[model samples]
Target: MNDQELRAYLSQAKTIAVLGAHKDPSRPAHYVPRYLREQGYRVLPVNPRFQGEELFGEEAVASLLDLKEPVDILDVFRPPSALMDHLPEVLALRPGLVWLQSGIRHPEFEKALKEAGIPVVADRCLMVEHKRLFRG
Candidate 1:
């Protein structure tokens, strides 16, 4: 999708399910979601180690299955290979977009997502795109 298309998605998105969210302030998983939250997007953090714990003012969930309904985006921070493990759940939830956060993408997994009619933003930084678009 072009910048205009991506802008539309960003503007319309109100909630994002952050897979692999980390508590560490230094990590991309941490900072990116924090940035998204600051940008007016509700972030749902998903990480088994932090499951049931609070981060970003919301409880961290163990899996995609734990995300509340109506998630607009699934911003992945896990390794590409791990995405397949959540494929079934992702397909089931079918969020508006599956974002394989910078350097994270799986060909088969992306193929499946596209087949399911779910748009994807693989191997890019959501934070980068959001700022670039809004910087105008």
Candidate 2:
């Protein structure tokens, strides 16, 4: 999606699902969602490694398929190579938009997502974009 479209998505988003989220404070996977939480967006943290634990006050789930709450944006922090394996699950969730965090992008998957009419923001940091466009 273009900058205009991305901004529109952010403006309307309510809930966010963070795939590959980490518990470690130093990682972007951890802090990005933390930031989102601070910004008052409901965030679901998904990571097999942290399953059953809590992040941002929500139970950390193992996969996108595990998401029980409504998700407006599905923000991915996984490696590019792992995206293909998770695409089906993500599609099943049918979020309004998908965000491939900086350094995480697969051209084929992106094409498929767009073809599915799912708005996608590829190779961008959700936290960075949010700060740039929505910060007070």
Candidate 3:
């Protein structure tokens, strides 16, 4: 999608499920979701290591299956090699959009996501896009 299209889609998604989220402030996995929450989006943190722990007023879930409610977007911060393990859960959630953060994308996975009718922002930073399109 183009810049305008992306911005429009993002504007409509108020909830985001962050997979591989981290508690460390130094990591993008941690700060990105925190930033999203600060921007008024509902951010659900997901990480087995941090499961049951609160990060942004919401407890970190062990997996996507732990979320009883639906989310608009699924923001992934895990490495490509680890994606396969989480892909099934993500597909089960069927979020409106899936964002593969910078340096994270696989042709096979991209094909699968597109086939599933979920739009994607591959190899991009959500923080950068949000600031450029929403904060400008």
lDDT, candidates in the order shown: 0.90, 0.89, 0.90
Which stretches of candidate 3 lie above 4 Å from their native place? none
lDDT string, candidate 1, 28-109, tens digits: 9999999999999999999998998888889998988877678899999999878889899899888988899888869999
lDDT, candidate 3, 6-119, per-residue tens: 988889888899989999999999999989998889999999999999988899999998998898988999899998778798889999899999999888888888999988
Kindly provide the TM-score of model 1 when superposed on the true structure, using C-alpha atoms: 0.97
- Model 2, 17-132: lDDT tens digits are 99998999999999999999888799999999999998989899898888877789998999988989988998899889999999987998998898999988888898889988
lDDT of 3: 0.90
Pairs that collide in candidate 1 are none
Arrange candidates by TM-score, highest first: which order?
1, 3, 2
Candidate 1: regions farther than 4 A off: none
What TM-score would each prediction reach against the true structure? 0.97, 0.94, 0.96
lDDT of 1 at 95: 91
> Which prediction has more favorable lDDT, 1 or 2?
1
Tell me the spans in candidate 2 whose CA falls farther than 4 Å from its real position.
Answer: none
